[PDB]
Each structure stands twice: as C-alpha cells, then as structure tokens.
Amino acid sequence: VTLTLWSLDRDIQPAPNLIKEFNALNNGIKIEYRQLQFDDVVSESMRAYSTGNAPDIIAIDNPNHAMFASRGAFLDVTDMIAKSDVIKTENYFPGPLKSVTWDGKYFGVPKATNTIALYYNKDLFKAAGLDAAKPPQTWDELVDAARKLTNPAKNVYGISFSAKANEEGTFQFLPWAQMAGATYKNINTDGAVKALETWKTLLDEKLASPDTLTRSQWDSTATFNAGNAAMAISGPWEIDRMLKDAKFDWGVTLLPVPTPDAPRSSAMGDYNWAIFSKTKHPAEAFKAIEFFASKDKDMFKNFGQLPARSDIPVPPTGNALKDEALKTFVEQLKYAQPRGPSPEWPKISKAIQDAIQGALSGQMTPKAALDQAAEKIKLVDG
Ligand SMILES: [Cl-]
Ligand SMILES: [K+]
Numbered sequence: 001v002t003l004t005l006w007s008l009d010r011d012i013q014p015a016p017n018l019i020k021e022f023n024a025l026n027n028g029i030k031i032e033y034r035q036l037q038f039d040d041v042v043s044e045s046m047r048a049y050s051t052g053n054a055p056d057i058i059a060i061d062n063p064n065h066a067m068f069a070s071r072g073a074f075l076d077v078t079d080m081i082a083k084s085d086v087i088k089t090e091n092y093f094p095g096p097l098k099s100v101t102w103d104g105k106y107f108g109v110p111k112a113t114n115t116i117a118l119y120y121n122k123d124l125f126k127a128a129g130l131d132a133a134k135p136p137q138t139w140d141e142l143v144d145a146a147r148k149l150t151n152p153a154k155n156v157y158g159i160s161f162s163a164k165a166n167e168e169g170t171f172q173f174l175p176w177a178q179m180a181g182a183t184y185k186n187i188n189t190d191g192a193v194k195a196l197e198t199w200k201t202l203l204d205e206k207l208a209s210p211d212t213l214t215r216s217q218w219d220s221t222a223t224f225n226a227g228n229a230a231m232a233i234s235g236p237w238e239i240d241r242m243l244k245d246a247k248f249d250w251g252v253t254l255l256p257v258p259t260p261d262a263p264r265s266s267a268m269g270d271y272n273w274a275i276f277s278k279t280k281h282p283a284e285a286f287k288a289i290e291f292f293a294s295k296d297k298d299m300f301k302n303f304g305q306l307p308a309r310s311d312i313p314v315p316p317t318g319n320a321l322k323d324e325a326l327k328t329f330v331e332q333l334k335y336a337q338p339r340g341p342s343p344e345w346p347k348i349s350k351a352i353q354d355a356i357q358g359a360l361s362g363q364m365t366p367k368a369a370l371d372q373a374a375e376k377i378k379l380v381d382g
Pocket of ligand 2: 081084085086087
C-alpha cells in the first residue's frame with residue numbers, strides 16, 4: 001500500500017523523518033511525503049479534498065480541525081483509537097484531545113502542542129523589592145508587579161505580550177476570557193470585558209508598550225531578552241534564543257488567574273494528525289499514525305517539539321533554566337484550551353481581533369467592542 005502525507009514540517013522537523021523510519025519498517029506500507037509551503041495548508045487542503053485529490057494523511061493546524069471534521073472531510077477514527085494499544089486517549093492533554101473532537105467523535109490524533117506562560121526577569125524583581133521566588137499568581141498581582149517594574153528612566157516596561165491584529169492577538173487574549181468564565185460563543189460576558197479592560201489598563205498606564213498592538217509574540221519577547229520589558233507572555237519556542245540573548249536570571253510561571261479559584265487556561269498551538277475521509281487505505285493510514293505516536297517519547301530529544309501528552313517526560317536539556325522553563329510549560333499544558341473548536345474559527349478569530357484593536361486603540365470601550373464581536377459570532381456559531 002502506498003500512502004500520501006502532507007505537512008508543513010521542514011526537512012529536520014518530525015514528519016519527513018518519521019516517514020523515513022516508518023518506510024524502513026518491514027510492514028507493507030509506504031508513505032510519500034509532500035512538504036506544504038507557508039500559509040497554504042488549509043487552502044490547498046480543502047481544494048484537494050473537493051476535487052478528490054486529498055492526501056491520505058495530513059498534519060493540520062489545530063484550530064482548523066473542526067472545519068474539516070464537521071464537513072465530513074476527515075475519517076472518524078473513534079473505534080480505531082479505542083482498539084489501539086499505542087494511542088490511548090488518557091495519554092493526551094485535554095485541550096489537544098478536544099481539538100480533534102467533533103460531535104462526540106474523534107476525527108484525528110494530536111501531533112504536537114505548545115502553550116504560553118509568564119517569563120519574568122528575576123534581577124529586575126530584586127531591584128524592585130519583589131521576591132523573585134514569588135512571581136504573580138493573579139491578574140491583580142500581575143498588574144501590581146508590572147507597575148513596580150516599569151522604569152521610564154531606563155526604558156523598561158513592566159510587561160510585554162502580543163495583541164497583534166492577526167491570529168496571535170486572539171491566541172493571547174482568549175485564555176484570559178476563558179479564565180473569567182467566558183468562551184468564544186459568549187465573548188462579551190462582564191468577565192471577558194474585565195480581561196480586555198485589564199489589557200487596556202496595562203497599555204494606558206504605560207506598563208506595556210503601545211507596540212503590543214502591532215508586534216508578534218517573538219518580537220515582543222525580544223524586548224524582554226534585551227531588558228526593556230521585565231516580564232513576557234510567550235511560548236517555549238523562545239527559550240534557546242533567550243539563553244543566548246538574555247543577560248539576566250529569569251524564571252517562568254503559569255499564566256495568572258483573575259481570582260484564586262478561577263479555572264486556569266492558556267493558549268494552545270501546533271498540529272493534529274488526521275486521515276482524509278475518502279482514503280482507500282484507512283487501516284494502513286491509521287497504522288502510520290500509530291507509528292508516529294509511538295515515537296512521541298523521542299520527539300523533544302530529536303526535534304525540540306513537545307508531544308501533546310502528559311505521559312512523556314521532557315528529557316534533561318543540558319541547561320537548568322531551560323529545564324525549569326519546560327517544567328512550567330508542561331504544567332501549563334494541563335490547562336491549555338483550544339481556539340473553538342469551531343468550523344467558523346477564522347471568522348470568529350477576526351471578530352475577536354477587531355474587538356481587541358477597537359478597545360486598545362480607544363475607538364470603542366471594551367464592552368462595546370466585545371458586544372460587537374459577540375454579535376458577529378452569533379451569526380455563525382452558538
Ligand atoms: Cl479526496
Ligand atoms: K486505545
């Protein structure tokens with residue numbers, strides 16, 4: 001049997017390397033890889049499905065999963081998963097599992113994951129009289145610390161993050177709303193408004209740069225590495241550069257909660273495996289995904305990517321700060337929540353982006369902005 005697999009993974013990233021190993025097996029299945037190019041995974045992929053030309057297997061960005069699953073494009077793998085001795089749903093973090101779920105059925109298997117958390121400069125904490133062993137755990141503590149850490153004389157903002165008018169702004173904002181008891185289907189609760197007002201306060205009180213509105217997570221975190229922001233909300237992808245560039249002692253803690261007993265959340269990036277529904281070789285496609293999952297234990301070591309799984313430890317990385325950071329990130333992943341899952345996620349995300357921009361620019365109040373977003377979202381998902 002010959003299978004086809006499409007992914008954005010580059011030559012040194014997991015998919016093509018896993019494919020080479022799978023093909024080397026004595027198992028009568030062979031996979032041919034197509035490397036998808038930037039920004040095309042979704043467009044090319046539902047073009048291909050509509051014309052009967054989809055691959056057998058795809059690695060799809062998690063917020064896109066529900067669109068394919070709800071429209072019949074992905075194979076229902078519920079029973080296959082149940083029978084598998086390799087793929088066990090209890091191994092996975094809850095958020096990634098939810099992203100492959102539609103209508104009480106599994107339509108894929110998580111491939112990898114990431115999240116965001118709160119980096120902090122322990123040396124600037126000490127200079128401000130803050131105990132570096134006790135980083136902020138609530139939104140109020142976070143704002144208090146950001147104030148104490150802001151230092152115009154030395155061009156330091158207390159915090160950096162991203163509210164960019166792209167997917168990153170929604171990615172960063174949604175967990176705050178979720179911790180306050182809101183969802184994408186209900187994004188204008190007074191709790192969600194409090195989240196957005198908190199962001200507005202950070203900007204208006206000069207505790208976060210105005211460039212928060214236009215800057216990527218990566219570019220925001222560069223300012224933390226340079227010592228111009230005392231805290232940063234970003235992901236595990238930052239660590240190696242931070243080790244090279246940040247000339248200070250630093251730690252990482254979970255994204256703070258609005259009140260001590262509030263449910264935790266954070267953002268959730270990266271991809272899922274899926275089988276296209278008209279594959280002529282469903283059993284063999286599933287066996288390939290089982291093989292990939294069986295190697296999740298080696299993913300971080302080999303590729304520097306985190307499995308979507310709670311049963312796999314992060315191996316020692318050779319650096320103590322990196323180990324501690326990743327300890328926090330894997331704890332955070334217990335609480336990471338998906339965007340959606342919604343077949344109309346792109347439209348919904350744009351509505352939320354427009355609300356963030358409208359509020360933080362002062363064009364609309366936070367409540368007026370989120371009321372407008374909720375109205376748009378109710379047309380398409382509820
Ligand atoms: Cl097809
Ligand atoms: K199973």
